[model samples]
Target: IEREFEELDTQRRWQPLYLEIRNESHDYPHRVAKFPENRNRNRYRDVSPYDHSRVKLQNAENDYINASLVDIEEAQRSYILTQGPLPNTCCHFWLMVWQQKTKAVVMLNRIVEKESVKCAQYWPTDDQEMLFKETGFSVKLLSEDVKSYYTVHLLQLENINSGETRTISHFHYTTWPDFGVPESPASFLNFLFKVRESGSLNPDHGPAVIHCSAGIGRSGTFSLVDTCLVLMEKGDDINIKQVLLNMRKYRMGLIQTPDQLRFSYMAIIEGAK
Candidate 1:
């Protein structure tokens, strides 16, 4: 399809693990306990060619606080939805099902562990530098209720020394496969609403790290929605298709289905803009 963009020139580009007794049919081999491979050490050791860490992200003076059902952490920050303290480094990032409890728990624990050291947490995908921002991402368990609860939410960063760190105070998590529910768009819009509120007016705050298992599917949708919202805010003057293209340019192909794209549009329009 030809791209549809507005004067905003708003452009974009887009867009984990754990183990434990995941239903055989539900688990992918790599996503099984232990991950069965080496996590590219480069991610932990090298900064991406597009490092924009120096750019200061804007932090909204106000944060929409959602009383977490449960918050788990070690020191400075906190983890959400887990029943106990977030895991520690004794085991590798994998190990949730039997290792932890459920795949979700395993994933959430990994996210919690990463915050102790890493600057950001991402799932199903590694942190990538794009459009001059470090998009940190990670995945985790929310409820594992067999109905809905796999989440992929992004938060804005503020007042912190990179390399230097703090706890994840509040972030969004859901069970929907991706941000595609009838209300998914609106659900996610709430997430970005917080991001915009917490975000700084700097490129550093441009992209929010998002993830879920197999990263691309759900994560792609969230990233796409975020970028589109940015353009709309500018003036509803950019090509949605082109925006999707730009997202793929840096992150890879995004929004796996036709409905995902349509719902994304519905999401932005429904928001309190």
Candidate 2:
């Protein structure tokens, strides 16, 4: 596998391999995401969640949300891969997290990237709390631990009517570029390990919600690398390409660029060591 990586890198075949993966991936129906009422909720027109595997918002008039539940059974891993929440959809995002019992939100992009808004300022950024009256929920910032490359914010999410609250960990990777990979495999692995140590990605809790700007690119890379490492830890022989193909079955256009694909290989190799 190491030699294969070297060859792929040296020959500059990542683009071709990336194209092949895209061609081979299935285009499942995502009709629900295109519904007139739900269209405004999508961050990008091209990216949509397939109806069969999308996370449905419970106890809501409209259950539509632009999020997919990617379940890799063999690896015992599940992730809610979603786009950065739009300003209007911010309420729905928290509602999804609350209803899904999500313990952590893995954010890979900034609120505003390159003078463009990638995501809404969904969570409370300071001591003050933010209420989402549309969904009857509120989010309060409890604590923050800022690192050089990432920041971990402990948040208090509450159900206003019921007065029940849950502690949620928000793992923000501040340095990853849009449609690009992290600075180094080592640094990326370090961030991944940090999230793993939190125990939020485990099966006991709900699947961790992971997102980038569009959700598929950086989000897919993160989930793919983590899932591969999990399989490796169990001493399972993993074919990186095949695993990605399986993931694409649940969500289309995962790991967007060839560089992102190569980075997944790099992170997986570095992580195994």
Candidate 3:
């Protein structure tokens, strides 16, 4: 095979290219077209989501989102949202293998940097500093009731700033089929809508966390649905397709599939109604 060299900065540089087995060599010389990325791979939208003709970024309410995985500490020293439970910082940028019923976990710690044992609803011990150091307990603990619906209520206590207890109180996660069985995807979503008919879980209170197998699929769907619905609840509308584009941006194939798309769409409908 011929070696490859690429021209960079208006100059030719012979560099060994990275080649994938059964795949074209990316390092092949003299070719660097900036094809659209994976997120916008199917980019056929007539208008940009952020710069759309309908909703201008200047008229948007995008502010204060959940913490990112980078915010999570690698070692112990938990960053527990003592006020209210939110999404886990670690699951975002690492190996994830758990399914959250709801994309958004409730915020139980609202004490502003304080710890709340009462909010200790479903302690992800595997995520805990002491337990995760030696075992996979946190994942197991959080997913133990996979067949059943459960809640993780993080309670912030005696806030030094506000000097209050229970300033924030809400369930950490939400479920689709209500646990106990793996209903068909369609059936699960039907159940999802049924339970969510009164309106999807709206812990607009504070600090909601979401995690999925790598914290993308189930986790993203839940969070995305809530975010979209919340916007609609506030009279702001969003297109489902555009939201998925954004998710793919930072997380790369975040939603998993179309079934999830359906669930999220329904969630917004319910949240708005």
Query: lDDT of all predictions, in order shown?
Result: 0.33, 0.90, 0.31
Judged by lDDT, which candidate is best?
2
State the displacement of the C-alpha of residue 247, model 1, in Å, after optimal TM-score superposition. Answer: 1.0
Which portions of model 1 miss their true places by more than 4 Å? 1-165, 175-180, 200-207
Off by over 4 Å in 3: 1-148, 155-207, 235-237
lDDT per residue, candidate 2, 132-182, as tens digits?
998999999999999998999999999998999999999998887554466
Which scores greater on TM-score, model 1 or model 2?
Answer: 2
Against the correct fold, how does model 2 do in TM-score?
Answer: 0.96
Worst 10 residues of 2 by lDDT: 110-119
Taking the tens digit of each residue's C-alpha lDDT, what string does model 3 give over 1-273? 001111321242212111111122112211111223312211122211111111111221321112222111111111111112232322221111111112233321122224332222234434342123211222223232222333433322222333332311224334444222233334333433432442324332222233332344565565565555544545443554555454443333345444454445545554445
Clashing pairs in 2: none
Best by TM-score: 2
Instruction: Write one digit per residue (lDDT tens) for candidate 1, span 92-164.
Output: 2211111112111212112433354442333223243212122232233222122133233232222222432
Position 214, candidate 3: lDDT: 33
